[PDB]
From a paper:
Microrchidia CW-type zinc finger proteins (MORCs) are a family of transcriptional regulators conserved in eukaryotes. We recently showed that human [name] is necessary, in conjunction with the human silencing hub (HUSH), for silencing of transgenes integrated at chromatin loci with histone H3 trimethylated at lysine 9 H3K9me3. [name] is a 1032-amino acid protein predicted to contain several functional domains including an N-terminal [name]-type [name] module with a coiled-coil insertion (CC1). Here we report the biochemical and cellular activities of [name] variants, alongside structures of wild-type and neuropathic variant forms of a [name] fragment comprising the [name]-type [name] module and CW domain.
Residue numbers in the entry:
A (entry chain B): 1 to 321, 324 to 510, 519 to 551
B (entry chain A): 1 to 87, 95 to 510, 521 to 551
Amino acid sequence: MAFTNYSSLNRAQLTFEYLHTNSTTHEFLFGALAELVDNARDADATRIDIYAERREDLRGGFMLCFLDDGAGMDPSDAASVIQFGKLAKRTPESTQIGQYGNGLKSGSMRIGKDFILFTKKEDTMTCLFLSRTFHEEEGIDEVIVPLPTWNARTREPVTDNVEKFAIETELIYKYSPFRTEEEVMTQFMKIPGDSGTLVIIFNLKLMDNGEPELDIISNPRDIQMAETSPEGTKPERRSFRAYAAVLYIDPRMRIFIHGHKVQTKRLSCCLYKPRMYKYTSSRFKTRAEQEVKKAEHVARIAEEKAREAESKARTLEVRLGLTRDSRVMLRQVQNRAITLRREADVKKRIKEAKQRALKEPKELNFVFGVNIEHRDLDGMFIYNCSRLIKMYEKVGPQLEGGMACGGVVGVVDVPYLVLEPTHNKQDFADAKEYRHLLRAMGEHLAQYWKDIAIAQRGIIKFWDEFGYLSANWNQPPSSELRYKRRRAMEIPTTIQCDLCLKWRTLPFYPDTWVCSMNPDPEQDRCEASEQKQKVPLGTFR
Amino acid sequence: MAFTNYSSLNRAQLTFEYLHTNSTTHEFLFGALAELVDNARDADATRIDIYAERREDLRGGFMLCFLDDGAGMDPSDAASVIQFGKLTQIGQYGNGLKSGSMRIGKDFILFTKKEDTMTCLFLSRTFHEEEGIDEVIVPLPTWNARTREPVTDNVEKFAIETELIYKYSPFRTEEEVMTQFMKIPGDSGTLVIIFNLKLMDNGEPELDIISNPRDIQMAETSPEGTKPERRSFRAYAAVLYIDPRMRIFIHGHKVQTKRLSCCLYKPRMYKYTSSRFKTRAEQEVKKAEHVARIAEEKAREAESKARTLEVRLGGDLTRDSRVMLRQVQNRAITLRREADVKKRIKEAKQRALKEPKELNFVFGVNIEHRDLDGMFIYNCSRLIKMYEKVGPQLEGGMACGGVVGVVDVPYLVLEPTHNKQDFADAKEYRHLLRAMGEHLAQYWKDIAIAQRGIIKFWDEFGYLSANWNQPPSSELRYKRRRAMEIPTTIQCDLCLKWRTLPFDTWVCSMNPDPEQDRCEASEQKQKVPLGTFR
Ligand SMILES: Nc1ncnc2c1ncn2[C@@H]1O[C@H](COP(=O)(O)OP(=O)(O)OP(=O)(O)O)[C@@H](O)[C@H]1O
Ligand SMILES: Nc1ncnc2c1ncn2[C@@H]1O[C@H](COP(=O)(O)OP(=O)(O)OP(=O)(O)O)[C@@H](O)[C@H]1O
Ligand SMILES: [Mg+2]
Ligand SMILES: [Mg+2]
Ligand SMILES: [Mg+2]
Ligand SMILES: [Zn+2]
Ligand SMILES: [Zn+2]
C-alpha cells in the first residue's frame, strides 16, 4: 500500500561498529545474560542450561553456553535473528518478553567478541555465526552473517546456492571454535530433542588484569562477577545463581548453572506475612481505553468500506441489467464486496475482544512481605510482563532514616500497557509514569506496615525475636538453632517438580525432586492439581 | 583485506521498529536533546539556537528546532548520518542523533549546508507507517547552495525524494524548503527539526514551553528534592560541558553556561593517580609498537630484496629487467614510508605515556544552594552523572553536606553507556566513586569548616531555617556575604573567551581589568589551588 516505487532510495544501514555501540547499553553485565534467558523462556523452554566449556585457546579461557529445549527455529526464523527490530505487522504477542528485536545482539556483544548459535526444528538445523573477529581481520564494515542449514535426519546441506553454502561454512571452520563439519555436528547433537537452541558466546571480555569479567572458578556451581563485594552489595548483583532465581515473577522454566539446578523462587513465597493490595491504575484504564478506541475506529472504517462495496455490487447488477467485459467487472465487484465484508467482520471481532477485556479490572497487584532472613535485602522488585526490571528499589517510608518499613520487600508485575522497558531492560522507558508507580507503591507500603502492626507490638522486639542480635543493620541474624527455626516456621518450603513443572509445598543447591517424593498425600503425584499460594488481600484508602 | 567474495552472504538489517527500540535508551528526556547539542558542539558551532515553532496541525502543537552555525555537512557526510555506528569529539557511537530524535518525536527533517551544497535528510516514521514500509528509507536530496539547482545523479530518485518531503514533512513546496535552508545564514550550519512530538496520556506534549517562555521544562510536577537540571533544560544545558564555548540560546534567550568549579566556595583540586589510566595507555602503546614492529620487518625484507636484485641484475639492464627492478624498488619505498608513519604513531603514544596518568578531582562548597550537592562526572567534557553522593555524603550527617565535586574522565579510563547517561564499565566507575569519596573527606578536612565550626559556617551565609532543603536568606547582607566568596566569571559574546571580573551581553572591553580588557588579550586559566591526599 505504497504510492510509488522506492527501490532507488537510500536505506539506513548497520555497520560493524554498531555491534559495540548497541552492547554499551548493558552496564549491568547480568542483564546481558538475562536477554538470552528471556529468549529461551519466550521459546517455551522447560529447561535452560547455562554452562562453561573450557577453551584455553579462546580469550577468557572458556565459552559461555546457553542450551534450551524450546521450540527452536526453522531457517527463516533463524534469518530473522539478525534483523535488528521486529516487524510492525507481526501478529501481537502481548505476553512474550521479546518485543524490541535486539536483546540477543546487545547482550551477546556485551559478553564476548563473537557468538555462534545452533538451532533445530523439525527436519532442519541451522547455524548462525556472528564473528567480530572475522570482520576485524578482513576489514568488513558491514555486518555479514553465515547462516547455513542442514537436514536434521540426513545431515545434507539445505541450500539453494552451493557456492554461498561453501563460503558460509568455510568462515565457520576458519573463525569459530569448531574447525570441521564433524565438530559442528557435535554441537547440533547437544540439542537432544526434536527442537531447541544452543547459543555459544566466546572470546569473552577481559578486565585490565587479563582475567575474564565472569568468574566461574571461585564457586564452580555459579557464575560470579569478578569484583570484590562491599558491605551493601546485593547477592543478585554478584551471583548469577541468585539473579536467575528471581528473574521471573512466575518461574516455570528450570534453570541450571554448570549442571546444577537453580532454586528459582516466587518472591512472595519467601517472605513473612505477605499481603496483596490491589491498586487501581488510571494509566492502565486510559491506555486500554485508547487501544479500544483505535480498534473501534479500525473496525468502523472497514465496515463503511464493506458497506459501500456491497451497495456498489447491488447497484452495478441493476445498472448492467450483459457483455463479456461486463461479466468480469461484475464478479470483481461482487468478490471484492465478499472480501471486504470478511475483513470488516474480523476487525469487528477484535474490537469486541478489546471491549470485553476493557471491563476487566485495571489493577496492579502490589504484594509486600517482610524479609526476615535478610532484613537488609529490602525494597521493591518491579517486574514487566513477568521479567524483573528493577530490584531493591526503596520507596515510601524506606526513603527516610528510620526503621519504618525496613526489611519489607515489595513485588509487582506491570503489563506492557502500563510501562515498557528501556533498551537494556534494566529501567522503564516512561520515567514520569514509573516515578508515579513508585510513589503509589510507597503509599501502599506504609499501609502494609500499619496492617501487620509490627509497631503495635514493638519494632525492635520484632527483630530480636528472629535473632538480630547485632546493632549493625546489615549483619545476618543469628544462626543458632532456636532462631533458625523461629524464622523457618514463618516461611513455607516450596519446590518444583522436575517432571511436570508444578510447584509444591513441603510440610517442613537442590537436587532432582519430583511430586511422588512429597510426603503430603494431597500433592504426592504429578496428576494432583497445583495449589495456588493464597496471598491474603489488604485494603488501602 | 577480504579472503573470498561475500556478496551472496546475509547482512544484518535495520527495520522500522528499531528506530523505536533505539530510542528507548533515553528514559531521561533531556539526554535525548543533549545528543543534538553534542553534535553541534562537535561541528565547531559557536552558537546553537533551540527553539519552538508553533504548528497546530502537528502532534504536540509545535516543532522543536536546533539551529547551529557549525561546519555543516556535505552530501556524503549527510548520507553517513544513516550509517548506524561510525567514525576529543563527543561523538563516537554513530547513533545519538537517531536515538535522541526518535525519543523526542515521531519524525525529523534536517537541513544542512556546506560550501556549495545544501542537503535535506528526512526521517519520517509517519511515512513508513502510512505506507507499510519495514525497511528504513530516507530521502536525501541535495541542491546547489548558490543556484538552487538539484545536484543529483538520478533525477527520478530526486523527484521521489522531494515528493515525499512535500507530502509528509512540515514543508509542502520547494519554496517552503528553501525558506528553511535560508535560516542557516552563514556559509555552513545545520537545522534539525523534530516534529509530531510525543504526548502524555492527557494529550499534552512531554516538553512544556509555556510555563516559562524562555525555557523547555519537563511537563511534570516537581517534588522538592527535584534537581533543576532534571526539570529545566536551561539549567541542564548550562552544565552540560565542563568547558563550555559554544553559546546556547533557548527561544532566543542566552543560557548562562558555566564551569561548575568557578561557582563554588573554596574550590580545591586533588590529583588522583589512576592505575586504570596508566594500564590502558601502556596497552595502547604495546599495540602501536607491535604494529610498527611488523611494518618494519616487512619494509626491511622488501628493501633487502631490492638491494639483492640490484646486485644480481648487475650490468644487464634489459627493458624487462629494468621494469621488474623498479617494481621491487618502489614496493620497498612504499613499505618503508608505511613503516615510518607507524613508527611515528608509536613514538607519539610513547611520549603521551610519560604524561601524568591522573584524574583531577575538584571540590567546592555550594554556598548558594547547599542541598544541590554531590559529584558531577564528565567524560571527555560531556556531563554523564550529576548529583552523585560519595564518601561521607552517603551517611546521615552534615559532613560534606553542600560539597560539589567535579571530574573530567578521558575515554581511555571510562566510556559511556548507549544513552550517555551512565558509564559502560560499572566496576571501574564504582572504583572511581570510592576514590572520589576518599578525596572528598580530605577536602573537608582541608577547608577546616570545624575551625569555624559547621553550624556557624552555614549561619554566616544565611541558612536561618532548620530544614536542610530551604534556600538561604534573601536579605541583602546575606546575599552579599555569599556573593563575596564566588568570583565572577563571564564569557565574551564576541570572541568566546572566558574572563574573570574583579567584582545578558558582555564583551571583553567592558572588563575593568587592564590585562583582560580586549578580545585579543590571552585567556587566563582557572588557578584552582592544589590539595594533597594523605
Ligand atoms: N533461544 C531461542 N529460541 C528460539 N528462538 C530464539 C532464541 N533466541 C532468539 N530467538 C529468536 O531470535 C529473535 C531475536 O531475538 P532477540 O532477543 O534479538 O529479539 P527479541 O527476543 O525479539 O526482542 P528483545 O529485543 O525484546 O529481546 C527472537 O525474536 C526469536 O525469534
Ligand atoms: N549539527 C551537526 N553538524 C554537523 N554534523 C552533524 C550534525 N549532527 C550530526 N552530524 C553528523 O552526523 C553524524 C551522525 O551523528 P550521531 O549523533 O548519530 O553520531 P555521532 O555523533 O557520530 O556519535 P554519537 O552516537 O556518539 O553521538 C555525526 O558523526 C556527524 O558527522
Ligand atoms: Mg529477546
Ligand atoms: Mg524443544
Ligand atoms: Mg552525536
Ligand atoms: Zn510432578
Ligand atoms: Zn572578547
